[PDB]
Amino acid sequence: GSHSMRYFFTSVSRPGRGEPRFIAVGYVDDTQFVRFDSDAASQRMEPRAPWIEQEGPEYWDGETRKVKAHSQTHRVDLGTLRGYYNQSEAGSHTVQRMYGCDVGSDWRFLRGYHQYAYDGKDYIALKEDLRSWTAADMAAQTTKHKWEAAHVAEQLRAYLEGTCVEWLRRYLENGKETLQRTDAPKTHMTHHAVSDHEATLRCWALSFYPAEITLTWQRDGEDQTQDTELVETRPAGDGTFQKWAAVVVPSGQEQRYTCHVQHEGLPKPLTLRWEP
Amino acid sequence: FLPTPEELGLLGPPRPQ
């Protein structure tokens, strides 16, 4: 998809110390825009991006009302699922639910998705046609039958194809400065001698947005798949991302090595070399 | 913009609204 709106729900039981905790986070692409924490003092859906702050009190009262109802649902589901799996009231368990919609380059509906997990395992998922379900086991099959009889997929599909993409289009326009931006990576290479025989060459990509990026190392233009240390893309904390890739090279052979950076903000893939 | 609980599907037993 070109753009996406996604919500992530987590409910965790803590039998020893009170009621379950529920966390909800909303994203547009790689940018978080809303949060709700059942443990927090506000008891309100809270803004986490400046462009969503423009929304009026009716929006915030509506999101607060809905998120409090989802909080209740997912905290209670823990007890329901514990019973479905014959589990004791002693242990801590997890409920996770993710869903959202993607739009194409034209900002028109492309896909919808919805998945539910219990204790980090798939439980039930909406299929890509937004009309049928996939149940993981015996217990999930009974949820599936219940949702089939109640025509849940019809309501979910109407939300994913309608409401979800209409509000995504609204956010993309209102938050265009933040959301429609491309921050090409700021790239550099560092050299760190390991010994008198070898040196580490580290190819950096900083301050980029969106998170999607490809860093590859080559020796004489041959991909160094096996010998590259590639770190997971990580958040900088300011709404941008970071990534690096490193290779250990024989001292004096640095010139044979090249790093290539591919990113949306780069008109062409970029070649980096060690410049002594 | 969030879906309502009935749009997502209620896994468990009915609870007072």
Next chain:
Amino acid sequence: IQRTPKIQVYSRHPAENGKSNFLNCYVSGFHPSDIEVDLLKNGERIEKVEHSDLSFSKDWSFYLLYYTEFTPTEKDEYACRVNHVTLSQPKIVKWDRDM
């Protein structure tokens, strides 16, 4: 059922001694969600460290960003200490400005 956290300790901007920056500890790929994360200055817990709202990846594994403002120097040591049910002992990852 159980997934061990991946840990990355780094700064928001390339470090320059005496210049204000942000110290980050990114924990990801873990399950269950309960985790203990501390940013350390000379082996001591930094207070008022902030963290991101709990979220998760396609495979259901959780991720969190812990961060605080810092001013790196030549001699001060920074680190991130993580404890999770999958670890027999807390894991300390030292901050290296080159990573």
